[model samples]
Target: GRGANMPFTIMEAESTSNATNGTKLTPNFKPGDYAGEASGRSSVYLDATGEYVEFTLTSPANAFVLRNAVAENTTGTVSIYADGVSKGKFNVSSKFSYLYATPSTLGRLGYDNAPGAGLTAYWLYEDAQLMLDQVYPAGTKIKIQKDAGDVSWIYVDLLETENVAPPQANPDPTKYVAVSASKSIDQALTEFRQDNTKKGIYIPAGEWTINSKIFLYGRATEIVGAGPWYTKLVAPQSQSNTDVGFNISAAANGSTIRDLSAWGNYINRVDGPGKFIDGNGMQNVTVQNIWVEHFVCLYWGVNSSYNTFKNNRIKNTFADGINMTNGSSYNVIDNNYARGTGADSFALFSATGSYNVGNKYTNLTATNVRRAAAFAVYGGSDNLFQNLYGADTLTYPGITISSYSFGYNTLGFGDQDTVIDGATLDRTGGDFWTSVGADDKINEYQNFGAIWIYGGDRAIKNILIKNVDINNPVYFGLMFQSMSPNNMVMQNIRVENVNINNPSRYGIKLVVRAEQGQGPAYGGASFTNVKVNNPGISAIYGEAQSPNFTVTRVSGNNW
Candidate 1:
């Protein structure tokens, strides 16, 4: 591996041009011991024109930073412009630190356990400082713009830059096996398969067009990229049926793919065959910090366990954001986001009615999805979903727990408890469902609501919905529909600390029909501190018959 040290290029006031205010270079005001700070001094006090310092680089770089100083709870705005384009803005209207990185460490870094590859901080004198890490393409001219309101002067410590070539249409024979533009994708993949060294494939920051699927069968292999913005894999409409980002098999265990973006050419309908990343029975796989869009599905897996999909941004998919199905269990989907999805944002579905258990989804946010839920459980058990936030800006429910396909005996287990906690459902998108069944029949109805727990012949048992705040302007705030012709009972469900607002219809509908697989006289449920405000209709319904169902401190029904 050829290693090139792209060390920090320290630029001082002497090297900077186009200073709006006279350069305030002082050693006493700006400490020198800070790693990567300008040689023991800094350029200070830019109070006019906002454009303080400007510099140029000879080569292209992937990162840039403007190190400044501010007081605690200082308020101002700082903008970084690369070649006249605004890269990022530092909104310092509230309390924040005036320090950059704690240590002099460098290169793309992760914060808060999220997937990041290009961020680092530097340690300096104990004085409060401000450091910002922004992304940029290789550009010559860089400018800094700051506001004029801060009592504490803006002290420019140093301008740090990293000179790394962006991903190109051509390839460089570097550490990982590089794929060149002259070579077809098949040739690069063949080269990847022929090498038995457990190596990686480097996809640079260019449009690597693929017209066919790439099957990953290597162990301990990595598919590295410059960054999601730098690297792009394009799947054109012509390659819609055949082109997939990655088709991972069981043999591709312990594989890592990060810092990349994939584009799919899906327009209207979603075909299940095409996706950005497809995992099949793989374990210990890692897919992090990737941007996936315009696909049928962003990420699809079957029977894949112990894998991680974290800190990724998924959008514009025709189907679900992430679908872990057919006994895919024990996976971690953490701190991810999805928007404009055609189906559910995150789903756990078992096609064979087999048990998909022990999967966890935490800190997930979804918005603008159509006819789907933010979190959906079709036939899964023992899954934990927490810290979920959804803005239901389109069609369908926020959360749906359904036993629609198989009987409760086959799909539901008693002790297989599913937990939904710390969720906030913003139902700005009204509950107007045109269809419900698999056929997508056109029947306009408002029966579905924010949270719908549907118990079909297949029952879901031992579930808990806790600490949920539902802003409901829909037909029903929350509906529990247990409909089954045979006895498949949905049992032992708990809803605690649920707050609903502005519900148009019933605040809570507990339709537990005995013939609808509810029971032969079974009841084990509890609702605690369920508060409903401004209920346009009733607050509670269908709970009068069941003595075993207990409700405590529920209000706003006016009954």
Candidate 2:
């Protein structure tokens, strides 16, 4: 949350936009950072003249900012219009936008073969801003016009409007040790590493661009900044490996990093990856009021425990916004906003090395994911994803839980309780899915839902979902399935007080892939007070494999 109750509104280019003479591209991504932004559904592309996009303002606004992209090495401006009246224009450039890597992969358009060699992750969209002198009321026709004098092409992803004053620098000598943005930040960072006398490091209102990651091995101190909007730390130097962003070791216990913006340059989600902030085995660390954008992952807690990650803005990454993986437990993650992620925005991934358990995530939001679910629990137990919001997942569920014993999540679900309580999901679940070896190793198909439950090598047990509101899903509101080694049983998965409204397909679907000698894999389920409205097909669809899992539903009632 931006502090002081400063109001703001966000409108996605695909969801809330009306395009004229523009093209909407498909969602294409593969691994890679530094923007508090993410784009979904390829954005509204304006290549020819007179191409413009309009948005009906939902609330009064005094300033506007948009995430946009121009042609490589080109400069342009989008004129602003309100109610068909000209307001002005905001300058747009590709100065810090696109970056190409070696040995192209997924050669699709601008992402791969970038004049040299590229990758299929054309995601480094920059932002532009315009501050209005007066506030405009809601329902005002706000338009971003591509004029005849503008550049050849521009892509619009999202726009946000706010009514707030510029943030002030917090430089109190009695509270913090002021580190000038003009000085060498990496050197300045190392100076505080062993300096036991320094406990609080402060960065003022300026841009601090460094060429390396903020790597620290000792006990981390309170690294503070004026605000996320005031202080910007950018790392854009070209690198060959994963050590290009912030990484603090396990010794970072009892540390805090707050009120600052951290950016990076990471390319797609392939090998030699990069996560923006790596909380390496950290415990009892507090990361608050921080703005992290653009990376393979916004933040990762590896074997992290009893930590707090709250009030953060994470967006536009290639993968998960925040992942509690490789043994994480008893942590409190809440009050966060993450949008435009390529994969699950928040996840509890239990790997072979350790199990994730008893972690709590609350008051969080994940929206506009280009692929995958917004929140996913892969082989975790006693974990709670509560009071969350998810919307516009282009190709997967809003929230899903699965037990696995292979690959990244090599640990199966533990014999403990897993719960999803008070979740609101909207416009999620798309009709495109794939699995390994489905069509000779890398398959492409479709079968997803707004809320999906799956079983893998291990039996999924003791899961409960309650008080969920699923609205306007592109596909099934709730789906249950077990596949790939279908002997794994799902037990005691209960759904209570669910309301699914206006689903594009069935409200509920059950499918169990056939495994030799094992017909079905589900144990049983309790669906109580479950309701649906306006389903495209029937309220219940598909059926479990025989002699294993079975389902019962009313003919015309909700499932």
Query: Which RMSD values do the candidates have, in order?
Result: 16.7, 5.5
Candidate 1 residues 1-559, lDDT tens each?
Answer: 0011123343554454545443555432111122123223345545555545666654545555454554434566666667777665544331212222222221111111121354332222111112235444444677666644433345555555655344443234543677667865556656777777526777776788865577787466688777766777887645433446787877778898888888776543435676777778889999988878767677777878889988787765666889898778899998887755657888887555378888889888875454367788876778988888875444457888877775323454436788888888866223342222312121333346678777666666778998888875345567766553443456777888888887766677665442322322234456777888878767766667545444544442233
lDDT string, candidate 2, 364-414, tens digits:
888866557889998877888888888777567898788766566465777
* Stretches of model 1 off by over 4 angstroms after superposition: 1-174, 196-198, 237-243, 351-354, 406-410, 428-443, 512-524, 545-559
In candidate 2, residue 115 scores what lDDT? 46
| Candidate 2: worst-modelled 10 consecutive residues by lDDT | 102-111
Q: Each candidate's TM vs. the true structure?
A: 0.64, 0.81
Task: Assess the local accuracy of residue 553 in candidate 2 as a C-alpha lDDT between 0 and 100.
Answer: 39
TM-score of 1: 0.64
